[model samples]
Target: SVKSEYAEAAAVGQEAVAVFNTMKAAFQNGDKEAVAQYLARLASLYTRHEELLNRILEKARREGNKEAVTLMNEFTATFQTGKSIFNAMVAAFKNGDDDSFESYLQALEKVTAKGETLADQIAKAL
Candidate 1:
């Protein structure tokens, strides 16, 4: 069941990746509004996954599943940093600062890569 839980969460991560790609494409096409909308969708996707993952984490703790607990901890921590970078990217874009926007976007990509790896690990753990 925990594995299934993580599999569902990993699906959300995949969905977020797709949304992020769409946002990037919007940026390339100079569709600022579309980019903004896609960014909002990402936030929503993250929220949904966070709720699911937190529930899983609580369950793991109660069941004394040490490996799941550890994996979830790392996964959440990475996503926390990823979320901050996502916000920074938003601010940079709104301020018309291309430099900071690109920087944060690149950082986000790296964070996302790590997040996906962690998600996969979590999925396998259970």
Candidate 2:
């Protein structure tokens, strides 16, 4: 089932982004409560991802696999940037600063994008 497919780590990350995007676009005026809920869930998503990424990165470094270490670090860094921009967006949203929120969204799109390229490199190297 499609639901079960997300047991794959990459699928989970992809779905998390999709869920966040849906939540973001669905925001309405005076929807602070909804926004807060989504923000909290998104934070959990990123926290889990960071934990998983750190574990993978540490394992790779310990094994002395330079290529894996480099690519994993690059992937993790991109995810980190995405998470940072997400929090900035949260702040902007809470302040009623749609301009800043939109700007952060644009930046997040850019950050989330680099993962595909880095993943490709990692696959090729492997």
Candidate 3:
């Protein structure tokens, strides 16, 4: 269970990056429909990511591992930024608001980079 805990988180984080890459490709191709579809998928993945982070933090707290708990909490907060940006991106696409989509996309990419770092820290903590 302990091994699976971090493995699951790592897999999901990696997959999100993969999906984001595909989504970018679709965007570059001018496929708005495909981009929207990927955005929805990403939304689902982000929700799962949030829950996984919460579970990891709760487990660390229960185990009385102060260091792990601290790191996990930071990971969770970092992901919150990613999640919010993803939601903004979704809204921008859904409302046909292209002007803000690029901004949100850039912001999300930045958050994702930070998330990747936090994910590595979380793997060690787990």
Candidate 4:
């Protein structure tokens, strides 16, 4: 079901968040290499989610289910939010501003929470 898929995506997202938190800690410790590794892992996580979303959307379109279409759109929006957060974090890292990095981390957490909540709601709708 679409909701189950949403749950699965949320699980993956949560794992990504864990990695992101570690990345934040690495940044705080001034471990640039660790930060880079964590960021790369986060990027891979995002890519996996992005691919999953695309597949789900394609399946929904093929099935011609209006509700599935709506869910797909919502899922895509969540993915976009994740992407934006990642981009902002990368920019902050590039800028080399400790305060900006901290702000970016906070924003990332907020965005991730939104995704998790939306995913849970979608699961309940099933």
Better of 1 and 4 by TM-score: 1
Estimate, for each residue in 1-126, the C-alpha lDDT of model 2 and write its tens digit: 211222344655776788678766766454667777877887778777777667667767787879978988788878877888988998998798978987887888788887767865655443
lDDT of 4 by residue, 73-113 (tens): 88678769768878888888877877777887888787767
Enumerate residue pairs that collide in model 2: none
Clashes of 4: 0
**Model 4 alpha-carbon drift over 4 Å, by segment:** 1-8, 124-126
Candidate 1, after superposition: displacement of residue 53 in Å?
1.5
Model 1 regions more than 4 Å off: none
TM-score of each: 0.92, 0.81, 0.91, 0.81
| Collision pairs in model 1 | none
Ranking by lDDT: 1, 3, 4, 2
TM-score of 3: 0.91
Best by TM-score: 1
lDDT of 1 by residue, 34-102 (tens): 988998899899899888889889989988988878989998899899989998998988899878877
List candidate 3 stretches off by more than 4 Å. none
Error of 3 at 31 (Å): 0.6
Of models 2 and 3, which has the larger TM-score?
A: 3
**Maximum-lDDT candidate:** 1
